[PDB]
Amino acid sequence: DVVSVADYGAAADSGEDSAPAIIKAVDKAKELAAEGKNVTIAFPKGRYDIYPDKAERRTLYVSNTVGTNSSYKDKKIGILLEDTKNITVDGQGSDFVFHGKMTTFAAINSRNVTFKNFSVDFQVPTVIDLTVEKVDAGAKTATVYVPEEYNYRLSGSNIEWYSDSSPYTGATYWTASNALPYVQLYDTKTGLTVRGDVWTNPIFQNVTGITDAGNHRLVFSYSSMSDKLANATGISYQMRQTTRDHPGVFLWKDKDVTLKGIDFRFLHGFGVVGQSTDTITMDGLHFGTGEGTGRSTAGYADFVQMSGCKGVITVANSSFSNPHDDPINVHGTFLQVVEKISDTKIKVRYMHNETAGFPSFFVGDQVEFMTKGDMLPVSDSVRTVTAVDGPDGQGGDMGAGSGSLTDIVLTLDSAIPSAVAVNSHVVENITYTPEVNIHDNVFKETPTRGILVTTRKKVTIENNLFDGMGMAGIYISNDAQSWYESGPTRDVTIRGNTFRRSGSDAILVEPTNPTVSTTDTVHKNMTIEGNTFYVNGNRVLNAKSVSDLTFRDNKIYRENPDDTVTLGGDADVALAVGDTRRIDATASVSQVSGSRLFRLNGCKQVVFGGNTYDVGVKAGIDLANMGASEVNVSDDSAKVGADGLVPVTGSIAYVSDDAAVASVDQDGTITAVGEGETTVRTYVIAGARRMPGSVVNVRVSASTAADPLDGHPSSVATLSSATIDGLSKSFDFKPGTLYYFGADSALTARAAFKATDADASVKATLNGKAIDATGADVKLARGRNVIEATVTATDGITANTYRFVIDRIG
Ligand code: NA
């Protein structure tokens, strides 16, 4: 049972609006679904343009966006499955290009529906990503690359931005001028994204003029060159409005939704929102800009928001790059008790201004009450909802209504506990709490937190890579003070993940309760095991109010090891055959400053065991609002209430190139053996790593007179050469400099990389795709091309990722 959009007027690659034809095709699919058929809506492979003008329009109130604001209550939706079941939307590899401000696709009141096999983009994205390519502090100018997707007109020192236009009316969908309200910084050189001063864009401070240099480059002139702007070369400044007028995808009141094999190249307004939906599976989603664009923002805000859902939320085999908020947030909403009408009837209120106007309770749901101050449940407070009067989330009333989009009146099956009082207690819907399974994903290029999750059901975060999270890699809060986002946790497992280039704590557990309790804790039963943490000054774990917290069998490594062996005793020795000389070699092993790796704040029944700590890290524990009697380190080497620095005492090994000329024992005594010249090499072993140190050259004249590296594989993880030919100007490669940036008109290049240690593994990519690191002819696409070379030493632990970034000039 197949419905092709081609039979309803949507030709592939037509350049015409497909929105009316998709509506008709969905209509037919719904007819067949209502006959009991499993239906596929097929898109013959190609580009499809979907405009908002004729798209389905719905009044919708959406968690974590714009709250009750009536200016934005009406949503345009490009592909809407409503009130249906058993329908797969199969793009068959098509490219869907949306226009203006709209939601891309949605399912509402629908069961067993799937979206798969297409990309999602906008003609003119609403985040404007400007790369500074050159700055001239002497002339006080900067050269700014405006990606080809954007339209603009110049007027003196102003730039005016505009979208594309309606085919039906000629209306411009939106316009703006100069700096948009919010900006964040994607450093294309390092591949790190951070927030700085988000309300001050340095491209647009003290601009005196702008000139079009052609090829989509603008030369800005300034009355003064700030420090922020002087160091801006290679930075893509991602600027936008902050109003979340649309969800990017909306999955409201569904059951068994699957999204899979979708490339989200840009989402306007917000990310994928699940709301009051039972079971959503997300598999093989790639949020990120890719080859062929100079843009860098993929998400106007969050990528995945699961608000008040239930069943199982799965995110698997997916990748996340350059949102303007958290990649993943699974949570519910606390509503505050604002009126006790009777012992079985209360009014509750949406307290945060971006979440309001939709139902968080249906008849039959179970609720539980919480004391705001200590964020602990009221004992014996689970009740079943028997009646709901409040907003239905599409502008109408559930029950009698409440007279307000922020207020819901609940009737409960039995008298609530006497302790529950207005404004001191909140209510959580405990039916709409999901199990969470996030595994085999890649998170990078993110200015905020990687994963937020607050649910009482089973949570598994397993086998993910975190690189460059600007804030905590994993953040588990529970908040009835500012964000009003619910979910005390009861069963969390964080296992097999790798954290790299962490901008803050790798893992942060911090409910926002002001009052720290000695009887109970907010969260319980959290197990953090088998992860690898590369550390460089920030904590591994910062946990507040968790009981039965276990941290075991993890591996902690220095992210930037700097080891050597110095000599002092002359590096040049001449010997007579039979005589001996001793090397005065002393090992040098770098250590990581900053915080103790662990902090615990009001926790109970904490156990550390079986963890591996690299030399030179502060494997120690800070305690707050708790005693050491709640922390068990009997089976671990972490120290309570002390730094617990792992000693930086390296051992020294000695290997001669040619022992027929000169031999050496493991004390550093050279023995002249034969005539000739040879070099004896030192190596510093420090924990699981082995680095070379200074060498000694031995010259031995006539007279009448390796196995210490076994179990110590090499940790050399540098390149010795990196050549990129075919460019107007060449990079000045240095083994110690990882990151390079340039802009060039070249259409092709030849790249070759060589490891310092020929045994080390080199993995090279162009725009994420593997290339032959020994030598590859590469095509440079439109926009920003990124050649990455990752060298992994033979120890399997030490790696460096080099980046060569070229903006194409065309
Ligand atoms: Na419109």
**Equal CATH topology for 2-124+244-325 and 572-587+649-709:** no
Q: Are 349 and 338 spatial neighbours (Cβ–Cβ below 8 Å)?
A: yes
- 357 CA from centroid of ligand 1 (Å): 23
- 49 CA from centroid of ligand 1 (Å): 14
What DSSP element (H or E) covers 339?
Answer: strand 335-342
Q: Are 806 and 780 spatial neighbours (Cβ–Cβ below 8 Å)?
A: yes
What residues have CB less than 8 Å from 82, skipping those under 6 apart?
56, 107, 108, 109, 110
Neighbours of 282 (CB within 10 A): 24
Q: Measured between alpha carbons, how far is residue 433 from residues 310, 378, 458, 476 in Å?
A: 5, 18, 10, 15
117: closest CA among 48, 24, 20?
A: 48
Domain 332-429 belongs in CATH node 3.60.70: no
d(CA 450, CA 141): 36
DSSP 8-class letter at 165: B
User: DSSP letter string over 385-449?
Assistant: EEEEEEE-SSSSEETT--SSSSEEEEEESSPPPTT--TTTEEEEESSS--EEEEES-EEES-SS-
The neighbourhood of ligand 1, an ion, using CB within 5 A, equals 52-53
- 268 CA from centroid of ligand 1 (Å): 14
- 128 CA from centroid of ligand 1 (Å): 20
> Which tokens go with 242?
């902050």
Q: What is the resolution of this structure in A?
A: 2.0
788 is in an annotated binding site: no
d(CA 462, CA 457): 16
- 10 CA from centroid of ligand 1 (Å): 20
CA end-to-end distance (rounded Å), the chain: 46
d(CA 264, CA 327): 13
358: closest CA among 329, 332, 384?
A: 332
- 165 CA from centroid of ligand 1 (Å): 10
Q: Are 149 and 125 spatial neighbours (Cβ–Cβ below 8 Å)?
A: yes
d(CA 400, CA 625): 47
449 is in an annotated binding site: yes
d(CA 525, CA 227): 48
d(CA 56, CA 49): 15
Domain 572-587+649-709 belongs in CATH node 2.60.40.1080: yes
> Which tokens go with 181?
């309200």
What residues have CB less than 8 Å from 319, skipping those under 6 apart?
285, 286, 287, 288, 441, 442, 443, 444
d(CA 517, CA 519): 6
810: closest CA among 147, 135, 131?
A: 147
Mapped onto helix, strand or coil, the DSSP state of residue 725 is strand
803 is in an annotated binding site: no
Q: Are 781 and 787 spatial neighbours (Cβ–Cβ below 8 Å)?
A: no
Q: Quick one: fold of 719-808?
A: Immunoglobulin-like (2.60.40)
325 is in an annotated binding site: yes
Q: Please, after which residues is the chain broken with C–N above 2.5 Å?
A: 705
485 is in an annotated binding site: yes
Phi first, then psi, for residue 313 (nearest 5°) are: -100, 120
> Which tokens go with 155?
């007027």
d(CA 257, CA 109): 11
- 154 CA from centroid of ligand 1 (Å): 26
User: DSSP letter string over 74-96?
Assistant: EEEEEEEEES-EEEEEEEEEEEE
Q: Are 324 and 271 spatial neighbours (Cβ–Cβ below 8 Å)?
A: no
647: closest CA among 615, 620, 618?
A: 615
- 105 CA from centroid of ligand 1 (Å): 16
- 53 CA from centroid of ligand 1 (Å): 4
d(CA 532, CA 344): 50
Q: Are 699 and 675 spatial neighbours (Cβ–Cβ below 8 Å)?
A: no
Burial of 127 (0-12, 13-18, 19+ CB in 10 A): buried
Between strands 606-609 and 631-635, the pairing is parallel
d(CA 267, CA 323): 9
Between strands 151-155 and 158-162, the pairing is antiparallel
Neighbours of 269 (CB within 10 A): 25
Mapped onto helix, strand or coil, the DSSP state of residue 18 is coil
Q: Are 585 and 668 spatial neighbours (Cβ–Cβ below 8 Å)?
A: yes
What technique was this entry resolved by? X-ray
Q: Are 420 and 340 spatial neighbours (Cβ–Cβ below 8 Å)?
A: yes
User: DSSP letter string over 514-581?
Assistant: SSPPSS--SEEEEEEES-EEEESSS-SEEEESEEEEEEES-EEEESS--EEEE--S-SEEEEETT-EE
Neighbours of 578 (CB within 10 A): 13
d(CA 30, CA 106): 15
> Which tokens go with 774?
């020994």
d(CA 602, CA 517): 7
Phi first, then psi, for residue 375 (nearest 5°) are: 55, 30
Q: Are 761 and 770 spatial neighbours (Cβ–Cβ below 8 Å)?
A: no
d(CA 284, CA 264): 11
- Give the 3-state DSSP-derived string for 780-808, with helices as H, strands as E and coil as C: CCCCEEEEEEEEECCCCCCEEEEEEEEEE
What residues have CB less than 8 Å from 192, skipping those under 6 apart?
186, 445, 468, 470, 501, 503
d(CA 2, CA 12): 17
Architecture of domain 2-124+244-325: 3 Solenoid (2.160)
- Indicate if the alpha-carbon torsion angle 766, 770, 776, 781 is positive or negative: negative
Q: Are 284 and 263 spatial neighbours (Cβ–Cβ below 8 Å)?
A: no
d(CA 585, CA 281): 58
d(CA 646, CA 642): 12
> Which tokens go with 504?
């803050």
* Domain layout of the chain by residue ranges: 2-124+244-325, 128-240, 332-429, 437-561+592-640, 572-587+649-709, 719-808
